[PDB]
Amino acid sequence: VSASSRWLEGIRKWYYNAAGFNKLGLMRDDTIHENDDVKEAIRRLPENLYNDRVFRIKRALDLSMRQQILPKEQWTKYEEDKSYLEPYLKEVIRERKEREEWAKK
Amino acid sequence: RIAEVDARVVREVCSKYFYDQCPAVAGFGPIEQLPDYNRIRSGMFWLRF
Amino acid sequence: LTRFLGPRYRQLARNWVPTASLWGAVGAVGLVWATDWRLILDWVPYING
Amino acid sequence: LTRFLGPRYRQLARNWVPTASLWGAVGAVGLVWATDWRLILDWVPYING
Amino acid sequence: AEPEHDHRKRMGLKMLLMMGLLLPLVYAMKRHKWSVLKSRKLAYRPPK
Amino acid sequence: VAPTLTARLYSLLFRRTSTFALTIVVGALFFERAFDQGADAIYEHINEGKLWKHIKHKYEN
Amino acid sequence: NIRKSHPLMKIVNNAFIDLPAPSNISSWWNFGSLLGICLILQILTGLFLAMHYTSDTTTAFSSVTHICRDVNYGWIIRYMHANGASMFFICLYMHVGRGLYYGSYTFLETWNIGVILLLTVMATAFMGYVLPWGQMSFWGATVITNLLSAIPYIGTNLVEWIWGGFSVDKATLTRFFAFHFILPFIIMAIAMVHLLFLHETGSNNPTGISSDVDKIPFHPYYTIKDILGALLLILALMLLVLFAPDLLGDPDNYTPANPLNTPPHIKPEWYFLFAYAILRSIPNKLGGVLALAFSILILALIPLLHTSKQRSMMFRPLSQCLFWALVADLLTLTWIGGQPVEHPYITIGQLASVLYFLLILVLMPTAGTIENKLLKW
């Protein structure tokens, strides 16, 4: 399934580098907008993933202050970006939709 | 040496080492409220003096 | 914002439609009264003066 | 308000009289400078123009 | 139509000269205070 | 002048806030006289013929 | 510690000294304080202009000339007030554009209070321009006030009620002076509620990511950064006042008002040209007046059109291009607004007006959705 799949993934990797959050050492889930679903998922993160999220964001804000980026060696590789928050967020959303479905009857 | 010390000696000796000098700060623990270094440095002089 | 489409929410709207209808009469009469709206007040019996 | 009459309070006043004297020079010069007080500035050497 | 012409040009000259002084000095005050942050270094040492 | 110039200015005038303020108010006094004097001399040099005070000699009375 | 406990200084401390602020807010966050500096500049200069101004139609023109000719340094105060108003609109549009780019509109109360501040400053500056009673002053008052005549079934009554007569006249100028005096003080009060709601959350930053992990005190970092920016605001103002005081004005305004003749080349101030261009691209009277109002009131809808799962455009290239297509499109409408209603400017202004609303309503929300799919979420 290489022909058509790799072209789509090729455009996604293009956009990933164009977005440029990897240039500050960040991962995709570090950039999501914090709404109530996201605050709960972050709350549910285990100790290590929470502490890693804190330092990466702190390192990126420090760079943004200095208008700098990391050296190219330290950029977040597209293939190594871990969606550590997505599974927690999916459950938080699934729970809220259950409440909403019960609130309808 | 202690008897030589009076209030003037303390004001002169302390100003020599404290007043408008850059301190070294070390913080450990829940230190979010630890003041910024500039604010600490500004605490080493008095605008009124 | 699809979550407000359900049997409970349409029972809730049905309970509050008599009240909202009446607050429309309050505002309508209040607007006609405060502005001396001749287009409507010519039809009221005793007001005609 | 007699409690401020004592040996410590007169040592404290003596420490701050050099500073208050200087803040009077700041205000005096600042008042003369801001108002272009000719009565005083005619005596300063280079200012005369 | 513009009697203030000459006086405004004299003021304009003084404004440019003072700004040429005050802009780099005030800029220097900003960088002086901010240097604490601009040269700060971070390190992450989590337990393993 | 073996001690640094900036070093001697600090010990004498900038250490205390009171003398740090006195040097400023006294500096603004002497700065105002010299700045206006030099600024006006430059505006007048560019416009040497044009100004009235350059023509007031014609109209003696 | 006494900065924190005094009932009055605690408000000042928690707003300008110990306020936690992001460590990485760029120069685009300087325009908030510059808007307050501008508001304080206009109040001071404006107040000193009211000490030598008369709202009589027969002497309003002459009282302004009396300021610029006989009052000691009255001219410099006068042109600071006029150019300060233009600097006010420079800061407004940058303040707004900052919030659109970086997603600061997600503070709904602060944003919506902001839209109110924009409209009142617009109303204030419009009435201010009517006071000197030049040609553009009078016909500016004529055109803009007549916009209410487009309101069906009550429009002429609202217009004649506002005018105090069957046309703009002495009664209209005297009341516009009273409104222009008081409306800035209401703006200052609304600007405090603007800041009140902001401090609930603190500031956004260029990354759109929460900055609670890295906060710095407002003092001394942003006190000195705001001081530096103010000196640059004064530089921008004094360049206009001291080297080009008529560059942003219209020469016809130096002729007294004449109700009998309208100038042929109507050109508003530069800060209204983009919206003036939107209105005339619609020949229908009511349609063009509604499009004018909606070109500004659409800001209240921007929070509802946010589709991206990221707050700031820093990491959104497709949105960035559409954002700058909106700035260049607004720059086009400003250009078309300053040209007469003739070929090809009529068609260009129509296409730019469609592109303005097309970008905000359709293209930019769709770009944010494409970006989400490209990141697989």
Ligand SMILES: CCCCCCCCCCCCCCCC(=O)OC[C@H](COP(=O)(O)OCCN)OC(=O)CCCCCCCCCCCCCCC
């Ligand atoms: C009650 C008082 C209310 C004041 C409210 C003011 C609001 C702030 C407006 C800012 C104006 C900028 C300076 C105008 C200069 C001018 O115009 O001065 C013209 C004079 C020459 O004048 P001269 O040639 O007659 O010779 C004078 C007779 N000896 O030299 C200048 O250019 C000095 C200005 C230097 C460049 C600007 C530096 C800006 C510093 C900001 C300080 C602001 C103080 C704030 C006061 C509230």
Ligand SMILES: CCCCCCCCCCCCCCCCCC(=O)OC[C@H](COP(=O)(O)OCCN)OC(=O)CCCCCCCCCCCCC
């Ligand atoms: C309303 C009527 C208006 C009429 C007047 C129209 C005239 C417009 C004239 C053009 C003005 C151009 C201003 C200068 C823009 C410079 C842009 C720039 O420097 O680059 C983009 C910059 C990139 O920075 P990031 O934050 O993405 O990442 C930084 C990482 N190093 O990202 C940024 O810095 C973007 C910040 C937001 C810029 C604000 C510009 C808004 C212009 C007005 C908008 C009006 C909306 C109603």
Ligand SMILES: CCCCCCCCCCCCCC(=O)OC[C@H](COP(=O)(O)OCC[N+](C)(C)C)OC(=O)CCCCCCCCCCCCC
């Ligand atoms: C387009 C134009 C639209 C205008 C249309 C006209 C609208 C007229 C008002 C209608 C709304 C009346 C509702 C109302 O009365 O409630 C507010 C309070 C509570 O009344 P109360 O009797 O205490 O308890 C109500 C219980 N209930 C309903 C079960 C009987 O009742 C009150 O307190 C109201 C009476 C107090 C008057 C004093 C307050 C006014 C400001 C003071 C002015 C005088 C001093 C300067």
Ligand SMILES: CCCCCCCCCCCCCC(=O)OC[C@H](COP(=O)(O)OCC[N+](C)(C)C)OC(=O)CCCCCCCCCCCCC
């Ligand atoms: C009757 C008339 C009376 C008037 C007489 C004139 C008085 C002149 C002022 C004298 C007071 C000076 C005291 C002073 O400088 O302290 C305040 C701060 C701190 O200075 P700093 O160097 O940071 O630390 C002082 C430490 N020391 C004393 C040991 C060296 O220093 C400062 O920050 C002051 C310089 C900052 C200028 C910017 C603030 C002004 C408002 C912004 C205007 C420009 C933008 C619109």
Ligand code: HEM
């Ligand atoms: C008289 C007019 C205004 C004044 C004096 C004013 C002042 C301020 C100040 C001081 C801040 C905080 C500092 C800063 O972000 O620069 C701020 C933030 C903000 N303003 Fe305004 N503002 C005005 C009008 C507006 C308008 C018209 C809008 C939008 C339609 C707006 C939207 C915002 C937003 C969203 C923020 C938060 C920015 C952030 O946290 O990144 N403001 N304003």
Ligand code: HEM
């Ligand atoms: C947000 C605040 C303000 C803005 C944006 C503003 C804007 C303007 C503008 C654009 C003009 C036209 C100037 C001209 O055509 O020459 C003007 C005139 C005037 N303004 Fe304001 N103004 C503000 C506040 C005030 C205040 C608070 C006062 C009085 C206390 C005031 C008093 C005057 C007077 C008397 C004039 C007529 C003199 C003249 O035309 O220069 N203004 N204003």
Ligand SMILES: C[C@@]1(c2ccc(Oc3ccccc3)nc2)OC(=O)N(Nc2ccccc2)C1=O
């Ligand atoms: C200063 C000015 C003004 C102020 C404020 C103002 O608000 C707005 C700014 C942007 C968007 C919406 C409103 N819109 C015009 O008032 C005035 O009469 N004209 N010129 C004029 C001449 C003929 C017709 C119309 C206007 C102006 O440009």
Ligand SMILES: CCCCCC(=O)OC[C@H](COP(=O)([O-])OCCN)OC(=O)CCCCC
């Ligand atoms: C008439 C002037 C009254 C004094 C105001 C003043 O200077 O504020 C204090 C600070 C500097 O003192 P500090 O912050 O080092 O704290 C020292 C405490 N020991 O200065 C600033 O940078 C604040 C900016 C104020 C500009 C209006």
Ligand SMILES: CCCCCC(=O)OC[C@H](COP(=O)([O-])OCCN)OC(=O)CCCCC
């Ligand atoms: C929103 C502000 C509305 C103020 C308009 C106004 O001046 O009202 C005058 C008319 C007078 O009634 P009319 O029978 O003369 O009719 C004369 C028609 N010109 O009263 C009305 O028609 C009130 C209409 C209220 C609609 C919101």
Ligand SMILES: CCCCCC(=O)OC[C@H](COP(=O)([O-])OCCN)OC(=O)CCCCC
């Ligand atoms: C409190 C407000 C004071 C303002 C008074 C004022 O207008 O000052 C003018 C005089 C001018 O100096 P002079 O030598 O012409 O003297 C002329 C005498 N009329 O300057 C002064 O004398 C300043 C005096 C300050 C005392 C507080």
Ligand SMILES: [Cl-]
């Ligand atoms: Cl005029």
